[PDB]
Amino acid sequence: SMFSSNRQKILERTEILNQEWKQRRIQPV
Amino acid sequence: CKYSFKCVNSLKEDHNQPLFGVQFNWHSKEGDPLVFATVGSNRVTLYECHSQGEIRLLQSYVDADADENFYTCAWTYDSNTSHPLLAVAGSRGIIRIINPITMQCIKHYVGHGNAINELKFHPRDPNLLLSVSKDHALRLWNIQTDTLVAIFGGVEGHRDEVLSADYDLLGEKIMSCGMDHSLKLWRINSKRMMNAIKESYDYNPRPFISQKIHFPDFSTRDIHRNYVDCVRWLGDLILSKSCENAIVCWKPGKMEDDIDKIKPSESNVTILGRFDYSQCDIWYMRFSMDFWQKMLALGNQVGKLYVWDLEVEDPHKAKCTTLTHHKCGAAIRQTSFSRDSSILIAVCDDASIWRWDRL
Numbered sequence A: 001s002m003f004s005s006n007r008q009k010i011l012e013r014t015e016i017l018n019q020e021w022k023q024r025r026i027q028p029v
Numbered sequence B: 001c002k003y004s005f006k007c008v009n010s011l012k013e014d015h016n017q018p019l020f021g022v023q024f025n026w027h028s029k030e031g032d033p034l035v036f037a038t039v040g041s042n043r044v045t046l047y048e049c050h051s052q053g054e055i056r057l058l059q060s061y062v063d064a065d066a067d068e069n070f071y072t073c074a075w076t077y078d079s080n081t082s083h084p085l086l087a088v089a090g091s092r093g094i095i096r097i098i099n100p101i102t103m104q105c106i107k108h109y110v111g112h113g114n115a116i117n118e119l120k121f122h123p124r125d126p127n128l129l130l131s132v133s134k135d136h137a138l139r140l141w142n143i144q145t146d147t148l149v150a151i152f153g154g155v156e157g158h159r160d161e162v163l164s165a166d167y168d169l170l171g172e173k174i175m176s177c178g179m180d181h182s183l184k185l186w187r188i189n190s191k192r193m194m195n196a197i198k199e200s201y202d203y204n205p206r207p208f209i210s211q212k213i214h215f216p217d218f219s220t221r222d223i224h225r226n227y228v229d230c231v232r233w234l235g236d237l238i239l240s241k242s243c244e245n246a247i248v249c250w251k252p253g254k255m256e257d258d259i260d261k262i263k264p265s266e267s268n269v270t271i272l273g274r275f276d277y278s279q280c281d282i283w284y285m286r287f288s289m290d291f292w293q294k295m296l297a298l299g300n301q302v303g304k305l306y307v308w309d310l311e312v313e314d315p316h317k318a319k320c321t322t323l324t325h326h327k328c329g330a331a332i333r334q335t336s337f338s339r340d341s342s343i344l345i346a347v348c349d350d351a352s353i354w355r356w357d358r359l
Ligand SMILES: CS(=O)(=O)c1ccc(-c2cnc(NCc3ccco3)n3cnnc23)cc1
Pocket: B018, B020, B071, B072, B115, B116, B117, B118, B163, B164, B229, B230, B283, B284, B285, B286
């Protein structure tokens, strides 16, 4: 379905950003 | 849905002016404290979320110009030093990059001939800042080299003030919207745009020549019948709203049309669903999503906080228990979820901040 596939795209793409964020060590405020 | 939240705290900012923006710092590392920024009047205030609903004031920034009215803020980090940064802007049309650790202004950008409604940082490149203005245009800046990369407007640009914009997940494109009732797609993964972005990183003191992007890659005025004050991507789909007391989910072109194959001439548009709510038909009321785009939140002009579960296909069945507190009566301008979705902050027209922890 339109939903099922759009949700997987979100999953795959937010995972890419999550993996990039995990690599970072941004200094606390 | 099953998502439940408890209101664990609230406070009021002593300036008593409306709070127009709220953003959690999604750049903080796992385990570091949860920090958010609030903007309203000529103020930028930082807070830390601690145990037992504690909202600990960290610092305040006061713009020297008492007539400045910040409408938006956005978080980034310095790609060289891993140091956090905050962009703020509003009424004056000046972008201010503040050091959140010292709460001091690092630098500013003048250029928009009117007020700034939205600031968004590229999801991959933390130096690419996108501003949206009442001047009818969107501007893309490189905050590392202090260059204006592109100005999106002109011949087929917005006809009236631009209200909101959003980058897709991987930052290949921008969808903007405004008073002209239109929603315009602007691809930034085009060879022209990628090169302009490359050229801005090479710039070092003749000044930098910004690309003038007169033409979008899609334009529609057929989703809403009035202003479009908020737009965000939902995967390849779009979530946008007007005064119709609904957030509409749609896509450019016909049902089967792939977002990356649509032509700038594309006449069609497919509405897929709707998120209905009430008492939110006034202008400048923004909706938000959590990082994983599982949750959708919008506040209304009467202090109610609507929350939807995006993993539920039916946009009616998706509705979660609306969040209310008998002392929260002012207009909820904007909400922000913490990166792990465990906290939801709402800011109001009466300078109040509300904290909703997930159960
Ligand atoms: C105190 S009042 O008179 O009720 C009042 C009420 C609302 C606003 C106001 C709030 N936010 C933005 N921009 C952000 C934005 C763009 C799209 C959504 O959100 N603005 C721009 N121009 N005015 C505003 C100002 C005054």
